[PDB]
């Protein structure tokens, strides 16, 4: 009556609990914007607020366009430039050869705003803000960032060209 | 190629296919270097360069 | 026993499946053979691979009669049993006798009160290589089914322009020497299949001076069989025809035994297709 | 439980099922007593096992026979084989082995088709 | 006999047609394409 | 097929030919029967129904 | 033993009381579990036979390719293994090198053959049946549960007559034939 | 109209003579097919390796 086919009480790896590699074992849908049409972006009216990035500052100084006047040149109306603390740190960690561009980009006409994230992947900080609030316009010259904020709906992108600036998606430049 | 026998033959075959794949492959999957922990590999390369 | 044949057919089918999925592998190994034979660029997939370039020692050490016949091609001379359809007719009886005489190692079986599975299993129990079953219409022979027994293949031919030997002439008796064979104009892999089944249907290993010839010629997808005796003259070697003549034509081909009716069809004559008149062998 | 036993009998293409259980000493074949099998010249051939052995051993049991398929003589040989193997099985299961053996000896000495059938498979040369 | 002759003829004519069409389209293919890519090689350089 | 032809030798004059049904399936006309007078037999590539209709293109 | 916290973990990276480097994934245990076998010694002896086969294939590789010794010997070994039952496909001598597993031998074992032929229901139950003595190989029965069986006896494995198992089977099909007292 | 099949060939005199001259040509070439019965030092270190592998092989079998 001793139970037939008994076996030594071994240790599983596919079932047990004390293995650290075996220890690891209401939907959400973000809505589309009230301030976004199909593609019109009904919200933005002048004045505008722009976000400046490291590539934008670089090509700005390499083509000699002063910041605020070049912005008025591009946009034909009133606009305010903003940089984020992550972007400032990005220029800083680029460092000693571009310190003149740093001393330029720090100017008390540029009202810097503060971020709260680990890491300084300024691409991530930018795109998280712009999918967060849909009212900034974004100036840069990175190709990948250009493609991404092209993929997003209803956000005008702004880059350099020749000796002036240009914008991509804005339905009212003129 | 017939009187070759054993370890010699194995290393020859490896080197032949190595070049014949290196001429058109991606260099990573051509020569993936085999794994070894860091201090022992660095000790080996130190002794060899010495 | 019957279980042994069952799992035999199982293992044969599995080896066929593995053969299919290893064809391409055989191609890649042949390509690598050629590359090592002459140093050249090696192309993309096999170049990037690691398992092939690792296991190619045994593979380099690696490296034709069809498989259903493969073990006993030219060792055990085959035995054939020829039997008649059902409640036979007398003209058919004479002609089936003539077929039994035409082949060597042949025995005849009248069939009344039999069933196909009982017959085929009894023949397998006895131990017999190859089987021939005849069907007729109104005296005229028209249909013939050949089977090879250890779950081998079957072929079904029609046959039309038959003349019995006695109704050629009241001549005499044949010699029944182990004959010879000639195969003309065979092209396709199907052609190789049918010459293989008929070669293993004949006797195996004939002499050097045997004096009976049996032909097989493809004349527009109608296999014409004749049979002649020859005696070698000095300048024009004379052939005397003897034995029946008839026009034979394939129409289907099964990979099982004839009792199955639902094995794997490895060929089947298409009739109502747009290009039926058009192709040869199709 | 009821001490019971079951057997089969088989000519060329017929089937004879035979239940054998303890009872009052009767026979039943297809819901009809065995004075009424049909062919009336082979009724004695059906009777053959009983008249071979005796009658008391069939006075203390109960048979129930049901046959399907086949033709006349085939059914008849089927019933006789079924009755034979059923009686032998009942004796083997519930009474003495010595009685089973003397039964088997008397049967097979008479005619072996009672205890084993021959399904006639041909002989090809 | 009529059957064999008519069908043999039809197969003959279908083969004829296919060969002729393949010839014409392949001639024009290779030659006119050689001209078109000669001009591509020039217009890239112009 | 029953009502395509009138006489047996007429059937045989057309024998061995290609015939499609209005359903769209193929077949061939082969031989003449005996006991009726115009009927012939044919083989299709699939089971015909009853309500079908057979036609024969000719020029 | 604590789910010990951050700093003490980053100090005690390499400690592990459960799985060591040397018991490579507890491979022996996992295969033992999948095929319900009884002794660690059974696993390790199957390991040794596998290892000797692979050293043979390695020296056969180290021989030059076109020797008829090499060809004939490797082909003969492939006959031996294909009739033995361990490896499936006779053609890839790579699969001589690379497919030969203790899993393959242990699945050629007896109870896996029962689960193959759908005799028993699952493998542990098959081990119960072979231990209890209801299943015979040809003319004699088996009590050592760890029987190896080639193809030519896979053909003859069956249940023993006048077992209550065969009784239940033919009773459900309504075909117990108690002249044989099956 | 549109026919569908190759009718069965009427064997005639000239076809038989074509076949005759085929068989006779193959006779006077004497090339006819059949299935004939299936029929059936080196180096120091190589003999060393053969010896070792053969001993090991026998032990393994
Ligand atoms: Mg960047
Ligand atoms: Zn930031």
Swiss-Prot record, chain B:
<comment type="function">
    <text>Required for pre-rRNA processing and 40S ribosomal subunit assembly. Seems to act in the processing of 35S rRNA at the A(0), A(1), and A(2) cleavage sites.</text>
</comment>
<protein>
    <recommendedName>
        <fullName>Protein FAF1</fullName>
    </recommendedName>
</protein>
<comment type="subunit">
    <text>Interacts with KRR1.</text>
</comment>
Swiss-Prot record, chain C:
<dbReference type="GO" id="GO:0043047">
    <property type="term" value="F:single-stranded telomeric DNA binding"/>
</dbReference>
<dbReference type="GO" id="GO:0005730">
    <property type="term" value="C:nucleolus"/>
</dbReference>
<dbReference type="GO" id="GO:0030490">
    <property type="term" value="P:maturation of SSU-rRNA"/>
</dbReference>
<dbReference type="GO" id="GO:0030515">
    <property type="term" value="F:snoRNA binding"/>
</dbReference>
<comment type="subunit">
    <text>Component of a heterotrimeric complex containing IMP3, IMP4 and MPP10. Interacts with MPP10. Component of the ribosomal small subunit (SSU) processome composed of at least 40 protein subunits and snoRNA U3.</text>
</comment>
<keyword id="KW-0690">Ribosome biogenesis</keyword>
<feature type="domain" description="Brix">
    <location>
        <begin position="78"/>
        <end position="259"/>
    </location>
</feature>
<dbReference type="Pfam" id="PF04427">
    <property type="entry name" value="Brix"/>
</dbReference>
<dbReference type="GO" id="GO:0140691">
    <property type="term" value="F:RNA folding chaperone"/>
</dbReference>
<dbReference type="GO" id="GO:0032040">
    <property type="term" value="C:small-subunit processome"/>
</dbReference>
<comment type="function">
    <text>Required for the early cleavages at sites A0, A1 and A2 during 18S ribosomal pre-RNA processing.</text>
</comment>
<dbReference type="GO" id="GO:0005654">
    <property type="term" value="C:nucleoplasm"/>
</dbReference>
Swiss-Prot record, chain E:
<comment type="function">
    <text>Involved in nucleolar processing of pre-18S ribosomal RNA. Has a role in the nuclear export of 40S pre-ribosomal subunit to the cytoplasm.</text>
</comment>
<feature type="compositionally biased region" description="Basic and acidic residues">
    <location>
        <begin position="33"/>
        <end position="46"/>
    </location>
</feature>
<comment type="subunit">
    <text>Interacts with snoRNA U3. Interacts with EMG1, MPP10 and NOC4. Component of the ribosomal small subunit (SSU) processome composed of at least 40 protein subunits and snoRNA U3.</text>
</comment>
<comment type="similarity">
    <text>Belongs to the NOP14 family.</text>
</comment>
<protein>
    <recommendedName>
        <fullName>Nucleolar complex protein 14</fullName>
    </recommendedName>
</protein>
<feature type="region of interest" description="Disordered">
    <location>
        <begin position="28"/>
        <end position="46"/>
    </location>
</feature>
Curated annotation (Swiss-Prot), chain G:
<comment type="function">
    <text>Required for the early cleavages at sites A0, A1 and A2 during 18S ribosomal pre-RNA processing.</text>
</comment>
<protein>
    <recommendedName>
        <fullName>U3 small nucleolar ribonucleoprotein protein IMP3</fullName>
    </recommendedName>
</protein>
<keyword id="KW-0698">rRNA processing</keyword>
<dbReference type="GO" id="GO:0006364">
    <property type="term" value="P:rRNA processing"/>
</dbReference>
<keyword id="KW-0687">Ribonucleoprotein</keyword>
<keyword id="KW-0699">rRNA-binding</keyword>
<keyword id="KW-0694">RNA-binding</keyword>
<dbReference type="GO" id="GO:0030686">
    <property type="term" value="C:90S preribosome"/>
</dbReference>
<dbReference type="InterPro" id="IPR022801">
    <property type="entry name" value="Ribosomal_uS4"/>
</dbReference>
<dbReference type="InterPro" id="IPR001912">
    <property type="entry name" value="Ribosomal_uS4_N"/>
</dbReference>
<dbReference type="GO" id="GO:0005730">
    <property type="term" value="C:nucleolus"/>
</dbReference>
<dbReference type="InterPro" id="IPR002942">
    <property type="entry name" value="S4_RNA-bd"/>
</dbReference>
């Amino acid at each position: 009556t001793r139970k037939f086919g008994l076996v030594k009480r071994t240790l599983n790896t596919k079932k047990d609990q004390r293995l650290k590699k075996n220890q690891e074992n209401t939907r959400n849908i973000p809505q589309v914007s009230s301030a976004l049409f199909f593609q019109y972006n009904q919200a933005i009216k002048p004045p505008y607020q722009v976000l400046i990035d490291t590539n934008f500052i670089n090509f700005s100084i390499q083509k000699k366009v002063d910041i605020v006047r070049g912005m008025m040149d591009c946009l034909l109306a009133k606009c305010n430039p903003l940089i984020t603390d992550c972007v400032m740190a990005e220029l800083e960690k680029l460092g000693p050869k571009y310190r003149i561009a740093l001393k330029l980009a720090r100017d008390p006409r540029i009202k810097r705003l503060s971020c709260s994230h680990k890491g300084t992947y300024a691409d991530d900080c930018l795109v998280h803000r712009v999918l967060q609030h849909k009212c900034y316009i974004v100036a840069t010259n990175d190709a990948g960032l250009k493609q991404r904020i092209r993929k997003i709906p209803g956000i005008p992108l702004m880059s350099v060209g020749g000796h002036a600036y240009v914008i991509e998606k804005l339905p009212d430049v003129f | 190629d017939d009187q070759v026998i054993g370890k010699a033959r194995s290393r020859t075959l490896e080197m032949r296919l190595n070049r014949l794949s290196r001429v058109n492959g991606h260099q990573d999957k051509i020569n993936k270097l085999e794994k070894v922990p860091m201090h022992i590999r660095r000790g080996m390369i130190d002794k060899h360069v010495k | 026993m019957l279980r042994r044949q069952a799992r035999e057919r199982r293992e044969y089918l599995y080896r066929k499946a593995q053969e299919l999925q290893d064809s391409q592998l055989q191609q890649k190994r042949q390509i690598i053979k050629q590359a090592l034979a002459q140093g050249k660029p090696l192309p993309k997939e096999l170049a990037e691979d690691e398992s092939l370039q690792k296991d190619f020692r045994y593979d380099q050490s690696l490296k034709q009669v069809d498989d259903e016949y493969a073990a006993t091609s030219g060792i055990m001379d085959p035995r054939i049993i020829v039997t008649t359809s059902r409640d036979p007719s007398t003209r058919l009886s004479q002609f089936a006798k003539e077929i039994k005489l035409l082949f060597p190692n042949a025995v005849r079986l009248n069939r009344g009160n039999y069933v196909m599975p009982n017959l085929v299993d009894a023949c397998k129990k006895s131990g017999t290589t190859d089987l021939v079953v005849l069907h007729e219409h109104r005296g005229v022979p028209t249909s013939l089914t050949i089977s090879h027994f250890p779950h081998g293949p079957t072929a079904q031919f029609s046959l039309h322009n038959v003349v019995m030997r006695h109704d050629i002439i009241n001549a005499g008796n044949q010699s029944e020497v182990n004959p010879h064979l000639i195969f003309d104009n065979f092209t396709t892999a199907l052609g190789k299949r049918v010459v293989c089944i008929l070669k293993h249907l004949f006797n195996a290993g004939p002499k050097k001076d045997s004096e009976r010839v049996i032909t097989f010629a493809n004349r527009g997808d109608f296999i014409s069989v004749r049979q002649h005796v020859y005696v070698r003259t000095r300048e024009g070697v004379e052939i005397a025809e003897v034995g029946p003549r008839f026009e034979m034509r394939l129409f289907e081909l099964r990979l099982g035994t004839l009792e199955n009716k639902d094995a794997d069809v490895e060929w089947q004559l298409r009739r109502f297709i747009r290009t039926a008149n058009k192709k040869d062998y199709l | 439980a009821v001490p019971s036993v079951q057997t089969f009998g088989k000519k060329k293409s017929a089937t004879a099922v035979a239940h054998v259980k303890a009872g009052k000493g009767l026979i039943k074949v297809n819901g009809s007593p065995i004075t009424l099998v049909e062919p009336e010249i082979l009724r004695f051939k059906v009777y053959e096992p009983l008249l071979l052995v005796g009658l008391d051993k069939f006075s203390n049991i109960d048979i129930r026979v049901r046959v399907t398929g086949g033709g006349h003589v085939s059914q008849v040989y089927a019933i006789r084989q079924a009755i034979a193997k059923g009686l032998v099985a009942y004796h083997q299961k519930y009474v003495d082995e010595q009685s089973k053996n003397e039964l088997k000896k008397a049967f097979t000495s008479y005619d072996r088709t009672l205890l084993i059938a021959d399904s006639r498979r041909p002989e090809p040369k | 006999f009529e059957a064999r002759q008519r069908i043999e003829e039809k197969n003959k004519e279908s083969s004829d047609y296919h060969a002729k069409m393949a010839h014409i389209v392949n001639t024009i293919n290779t030659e006119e394409g050689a001209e078109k890519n000669k001009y591509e090689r020039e217009r890239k350089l112009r | 097929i029953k009502d395509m032809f009138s006489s047996a030798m007429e059937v045989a004059r057309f024998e061995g030919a290609q015939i499609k049904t209005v359903s769209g399936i193929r077949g061939e006309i082969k031989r003449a029967l005996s006991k009726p007078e115009g009927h012939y037999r044919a083989a299709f590539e699939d089971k015909i129904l009853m309500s079908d209709i057979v036609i024969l293109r000719s020029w | 033993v604590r789910k010990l916290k951050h700093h003490e973990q980053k100090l005690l990276k390499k400690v592990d009381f459960l799985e060591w480097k040397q018991d490579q994934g507890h491979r022996d245990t996992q295969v033992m579990r999948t095929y319900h076998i009884q002794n660690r010694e059974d696993y390790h002896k199957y390991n040794r036979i596998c290892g000797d086969i692979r050293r043979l294939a390695n020296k056969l590789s180290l021989l030059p390719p076109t020797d008829p010794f090499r060809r004939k010997h490797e082909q003969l070994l492939l006959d031996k293994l294909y009739a033995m039952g361990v490896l499936t496909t006779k053609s890839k001598i790579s699969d001589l090198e690379n497919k030969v597993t203790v899993s393959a031998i242990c699945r050629r074992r007896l109870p896996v053959i029962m689960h193959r032929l759908k005799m028993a229901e699952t493998i542990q139950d098959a081990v119960k049946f072979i231990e209890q003595g209801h299943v015979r190989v040809g003319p004699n029965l088996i009590n050592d549960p760890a029987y190896l069986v080639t193809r030519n006896m896979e053909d003859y494995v069956t249940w023993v007559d006048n077992s209550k198992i065969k009784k239940t089977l033919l009773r459900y099909r309504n075909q117990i034939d108690d002249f044989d007292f099956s | 109209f549109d026919r569908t099949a190759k009718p069965v060939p009427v064997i005639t005199s000239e076809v038989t003579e074509s076949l005759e001259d085929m068989i006779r040509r193959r006779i006077q070439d004497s090339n006819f097919d059949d299935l004939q019965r299936r029929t059936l030092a080196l180096s120091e270190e190589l003999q060393k390796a053969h010896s070792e592998i053969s001993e090991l092989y026998a032990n393994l079998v």
